[PDB]
């Protein structure tokens, strides 16, 4: 595929994905399952003013990934920008 065409399509799709999102259910289980299993995300950084989606990841781990996270010794860091600046910016206290 030509990059000029691939660009045209990516645009169409990206515009339709955002149009309907509005008016179709937020599928945030099937999401967390993609980034916690299919990518084995080690740090998940919540950029927000309060730690909602962090709490939701902590609980999606504690439910259906407690065994996986041991058997793969897959230590996972969940960080909210508001609460855990020091672990994101690498500025530990002396």
């Amino acid at each position: 595929m030509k990059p000029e065409v691939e660009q045209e399509l990516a645009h169409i799709l990206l515009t339709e994905l955002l149009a309907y999102q509005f008016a179709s259910p937020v599928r945030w289980i099937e999401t967390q399952d993609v980034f916690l299993k299919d990518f084995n995300t080690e740090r998940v950084v919540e950029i927000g003013p309060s730690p909602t989606l962090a709490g939701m990841a902590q609980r999606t781990l504690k439910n259906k990934y407690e065994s996986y996270d041991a058997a793969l010794s897959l230590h996972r860091e969940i960080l909210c920008y508001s609460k855990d600046a020091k672990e994101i910016y690498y500025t530990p206290d002396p």
Partner: protein
């Protein structure tokens, strides 16, 4: 052929015995190529003081044994004792013992060599009073049926060539799991969940609502013995012993030597005894309770460790049956 590659700090033992300075670090000494054959020697040696300080020939000491057997690699010194006759033809038995223990520790180091732990892991295990990880994890106070659950959990997720298995069944509630130190660190985390603090005090709680108290502790070894990881070595060792001319014939072994898997006598087998003993250390598990199923008033433990050794474990398995374990070393 490629043996010099494996002995990086050499194998000049006479030099190490004179000068404690020129002795390598413990970690090198523990590597199976040097530790395997040198444990053989330690046992054969303890056996010899025993014979000479009684004034017996090694065949005469053997004639007063009813049977002999060994845990893990100890099974080789056992079958070498069973052959011996006079002080002249002793050194042809000792050649056979330590040649086999050499090719086990050489061809098994090649098949699954120890590599660097992620230091994250090493530091996690040391702040939770678990050991330094190793390929052999020991679990006190948990039935073989309880442990085999926690490994079916852990081996659900892992792929084939990273899986753990029960290797030694030492007691009713004294098991050892063998596999990749990563994988056995996986298992250890799964256990920290289930286990309850040793300072909890459940004397106030009805019995059958109490949390399981149990100790999980890494061994000091360097290979995963009695595992599927060492199977590649099995074929190579059998061929490296037909070269160096090292069979054990059934006729030559004059006492029952007790196989470490069944408990059956090794003198009975149709095939090679040399072959079997390799599979009993490489592949197959160790069912101590069922190999030590003979009856006898007295048990000599020649092996290494002393009070921390096999003898004192064998004492607990048959406390009250009227069997005295002597720690001969």
């Amino acid at each position: 052929l490629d043996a010099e590659k494996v002995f990086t700090q050499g194998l000049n033992i006479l030099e190490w015995l004179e000068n404690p300075s020129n002795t390598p670090d413990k970690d090198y000494l523990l590597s199976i190529p040097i530790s395997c054959p040198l444990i053989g020697v330690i046992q054969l040696a303890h056996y010899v003081v025993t014979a000479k300080l009684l004034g017996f020939t090694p065949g005469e000491l053997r004639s007063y044994l009813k049977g002999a057997t060994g845990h893990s690699q100890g099974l080789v010194t056992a079958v070498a004792i069973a052959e011996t006759d006079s002080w002249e033809s002793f050194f042809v038995s000792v050649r056979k013992a330590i040649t086999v223990l050499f090719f086990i520790g050489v061809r098994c180091y090649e098949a699954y060599p120890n590599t660097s732990l992620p230091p994250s892991i090493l530091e996690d295990s040391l702040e939770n009073n678990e050991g330094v990880p190793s390929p052999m994890l020991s679990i006190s106070n948990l039935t073989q049926e309880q442990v085999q659950d926690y490994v079916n959990k852990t081996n659900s997720h892992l792929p084939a060539g990273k899986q753990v298995e029960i290797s030694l069944v030492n007691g009713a509630k004294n098991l050892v799991v063998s596999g990749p130190p990563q994988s056995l660190y996986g298992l250890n985390l799964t256990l920290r969940k289930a286990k309850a603090p040793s300072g909890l005090d459940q004397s106030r709680i009805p019995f059958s609502e109490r949390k399981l108290k149990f100790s999980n502790r890494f061994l000091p070894v360097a290979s995963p013995f009695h595992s599927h990881l060492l199977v590649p070595a099995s074929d190579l060792i059998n061929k490296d012993l037909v070269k160096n001319n090292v069979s054990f014939n059934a006729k030559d072994i004059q006492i029952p030597v007790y196989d470490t898997f069944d408990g059956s006598d090794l003198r009975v087998l149709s095939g090679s005894i040399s072959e079997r003993i390799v599979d009993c250390i490489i592949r197959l598990p160790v069912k101590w309770e069922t190999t030590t199923q003979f009856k006898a008033t007295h048990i000599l433990d020649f092996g290494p460790g002393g009070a921390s050794g096999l003898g004192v474990l064998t004492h607990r398995n048959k406390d009250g049956t009227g069997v005295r374990v002597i720690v001969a070393g």
